[PDB]
Amino acid sequence: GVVNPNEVFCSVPGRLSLLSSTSKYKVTVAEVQRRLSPPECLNASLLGGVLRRAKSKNGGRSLREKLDKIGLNLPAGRRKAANVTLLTSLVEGEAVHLARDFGYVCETEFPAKAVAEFLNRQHSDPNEQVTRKNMLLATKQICKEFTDLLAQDRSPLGNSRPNPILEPGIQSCLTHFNLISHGFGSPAVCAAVTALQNYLTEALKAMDKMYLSNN
Amino acid sequence: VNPNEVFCSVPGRLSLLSSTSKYKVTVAEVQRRLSPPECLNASLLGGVLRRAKSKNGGRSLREKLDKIGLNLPAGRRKAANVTLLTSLVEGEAVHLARDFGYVCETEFPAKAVAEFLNRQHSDPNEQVTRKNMLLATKQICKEFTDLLAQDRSPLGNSRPNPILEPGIQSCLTHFNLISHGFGSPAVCAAVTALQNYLTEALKAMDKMY
DNA sequence: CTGCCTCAGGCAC
């Protein structure tokens, strides 16, 4: 079901779409309150760029009035954050979409098999093959435990506030990374670790099949 | 960059409040977009170059390309594989990867993640095992990211001599071309978060010793 | 998908 329109602040065209490939992203009031709250505390001018609004006369005043109507208070004098990154420009829907597409290219285009063959060839002495296999297996297990923790993150995103399944200490730390990255961070880290995991799988498989590979 | 080699300058898609100067897009970058594996057409390249959608704007861009010696036919179909990364100019793709690397280094909670994951393995008899698994992971990840750092895929106006053999270099170049340069440095950026966790987990284990 | 005409934001200041 549709997000209640009363909980939607505006809709924002994606910055990274070619040829109208995506519908405008809905920006919830919850998302706006995340941007205005610690740790970023964006001001009217930075939030206007995130929402991709025209810089018109009294644009700041008109945005701060819109925020007052929904109960958010943004002081006119609030300091301009200097620790902004390229990720700060994103609305949460686009940030998550960008992480999903990163996941997609790491799964479908990253050359895990060629990388495995190259790195197996750098450590190809008979006397190191048992150690290399155990190191590859341990790396797979430690990486999976790490991505399994990130997958248990229940940071608020869009209009959802799911019940946390992690203890409040580690959840607040993961939420910090969610808020500075606009939701890109944990999923993009998991996307990259799939490329690593595919390399490790292909590396163990090429060791297993070494005889049939040389024929 | 020699102005003869600059096709056009493009404002960044991900800048807030005029934070970045326009990115130069070279002839060599446009040639990469027009060639396999992407083979962008006038309409997609127009969007990468952030050009107005005008009547016969396709025809103007194709005539601009023909003058600098790139052939883009009128009838070229849209590319088969388009992601959000396809919108990026190479300069902004590389900048975005470096920014991802900066937030992994400065905002990822490596110490809280290490404390939490160590606490899931508190059997006194598995600490030597866990320590070796963490060391093994740090070494395997480092060899992996050292390979990606030896990538000498052409970007912008640069065409450095490859240090890797041609087989592995063509496969890394494939990942460079579909990601417009973001891919390998972004994988490296994310492994920084993993490496800082592994560092903090070994340090916390050694403290408890 | 084409491309007009709104309005985002590049730019001067």
Place this chain on the structure above:
DNA sequence: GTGCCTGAGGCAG
């Protein structure tokens, strides 16, 4: 920081 006015691209169709 402000906000005009050029031109990218959202949206109509």
